[PDB]
Every structure is written in C-alpha cells, then in structure tokens.
C-alpha cells in the first residue's frame, strides 16, 4: 500500500516538527501539505503533563511516525522546524532537535532542513506584562 516507485527513487514527505513550550508535534504531510500522513504529540506517548515536552516523548513520537511512514511507503522527509513565534520565542526547542535526531536514526533519508517560525514583522503586545515573564 503506497506509491509505485522503483528502488532508486525516494518518496518525499514534509515533516512539520513544531516544538511548543509545552509539547511537540510531528506532522508528516504531502509536499503540498494539505493532505496529512502522520502526527503524534508529546502527550500521546507519555502519560504525564510534566514530561509532555521532554525529549523522551519527542523521540518516541519520531520513532512512531517513522514506523508509520515506513508502513505507507514514504522513505524520505523534508523538515520544517517551528517554534511558537509571533510575540513568543522564535528558536525551536530541544524537543524539536530530539525529534529530528530520532527520525534521523530511524532509517529516514533527510531532505531540506528549513525553519518556518512565524516571525512577525512588527508584533502586537507580549502576553506578559511590563514586569516580566518566566519566573
């Protein structure tokens, strides 16, 4: 079940790895991105809200997605990394790095590593006050 491709050529999907500051999403989609293939959160692998954004949950998520994509015939993935963006922080967290490495171990050819974080041109006001944020 999958594309009818010779062994020389690879099937490309686009893996959106979005690491929010509470968990991590692994969302493999079409090259267009409209039709999806797989997605497992940090929360569907570990049964605790404390360890939701942990690299353990992210790497288990990446192995689950890699196995599912081997089942459906996709052999290679382009990578579109993401942080929360906008007013929030712009750098993808350690969970995104952990998911990327874990899907790199799991037999996947890697295509283009590209960061799409929604950087504002000129943002609205920060969620925190004037006093500060994050302890």
């Amino acid at each position: 079940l999958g594309p009818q491709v010779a062994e020389g050529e690879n099937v490309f999907g686009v893996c959106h790895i979005f690491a929010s500051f509470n968990d991590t999403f692994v969302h493999v989609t079409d090259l267009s991105g409209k039709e999806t293939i797989c997605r497992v959160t940090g929360g569907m692998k570990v049964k605790a809200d404390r360890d939701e954004s942990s690299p353990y949950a992210a790497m288990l998520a990446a192995q689950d997605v890699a196995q599912r994509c081997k089942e459906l015939g996709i052999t290679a993935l382009h990578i579109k990394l993401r942080a929360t963006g906008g007013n929030r922080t712009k750098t993808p967290g350690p969970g995104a790095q952990s998911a990327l490495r874990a899907l790199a171990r799991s037999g996947m050819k890697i295509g283009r590593i590209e960061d799409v974080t929604p950087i504002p041109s000129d943002s609205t006001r920060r969620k925190g006050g004037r006093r500060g944020r994050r302890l």
Partner: protein, 178 residues
Amino acid sequence: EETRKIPVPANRYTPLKENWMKIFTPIVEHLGLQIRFNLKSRNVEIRTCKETKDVSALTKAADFVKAFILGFQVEDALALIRLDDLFLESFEITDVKPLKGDHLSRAIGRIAGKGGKTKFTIENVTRTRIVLADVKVHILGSFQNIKMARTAICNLILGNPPSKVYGNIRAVASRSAD
C-alpha cells in the same frame, strides 16, 4: 549521499579559521564525514561519504559545528559529538522582559557579572555552557540542566540580585539528585 550546510557570520570567520583543524579532524577521523568551507556562500558543508560508519553521525557533526558558530568552544561542542543527551536551547533577552536601551545593557551585565564570574557560577552549578551573544543567550547542556540554567538567567534578567539567584540554584541543584 546527503549534505548539511550551515552559515557563519562575519564575526565567527576568524575563530573558524584558527580552530579549523580542531573542527575538521574529529568529524573526519572517527565519524567519517567529508567537510569543506565554501567561501563564496560562507557555509560549512558536511557530507556523507562511503567511509561513514553509522547513520545520524552527520547530524552530530552539524550540531557540533552549529554550536561552535553560535559561540561555544571547540571542546564544549565536541561534547555534543560524544554525548547523546545534549541539546542547544537559546532565547532572546527581551523574550521575558521588554527592556529598552541602557536597561537592556544592565541586564546583559548581570548575566555576566564582574569578570564573567556570575556566568561561570551558573556554569558550575547547572553543569551547562552559556554563550552571551549581543542580545541572545545560548545554553548547552542536558534538558533538566537547561531548565535550571534558563531559570537562573530569567531570574537575573528581570531584576534579581546575583546572591539570591545563587542560593536558589544551589537549593534546586541539591533537590535535583545531582
């Protein structure tokens, strides 16, 4: 054979040139990856050849060279070569508190302290490496250690004096089964 390209700024060209042997030797010796530096595109290129021992070594080398470009020492990113459970988390200094001008500079000062001492103290307690780019903070360490270091740094850049931060991080490091 796949490749990864990472950029280098103008202020990291000379550290790249001086430390070049110490960068390319560990990548090609035991990881078995081709490496070059394109002067036209200003990119470090890392490639997989037939001599590559295992998969995902190129990701390890990419994290190593990226950490060196962000401002870390060559041995502190050779730690990323050897160890598996190490990450590179970074944030802007205005991400937690909107600081304008001179206030912002003072915040930078109380990440460093006098002689850098405060920064080194955190590096002694959290077992991390912190790099202060001009308005950026980069932490290299384990995930829990990154959390402790970012808690200390965020406490410093919203107003807390260094002694309170030292006491808090020493209590947390005592509680963290270190």
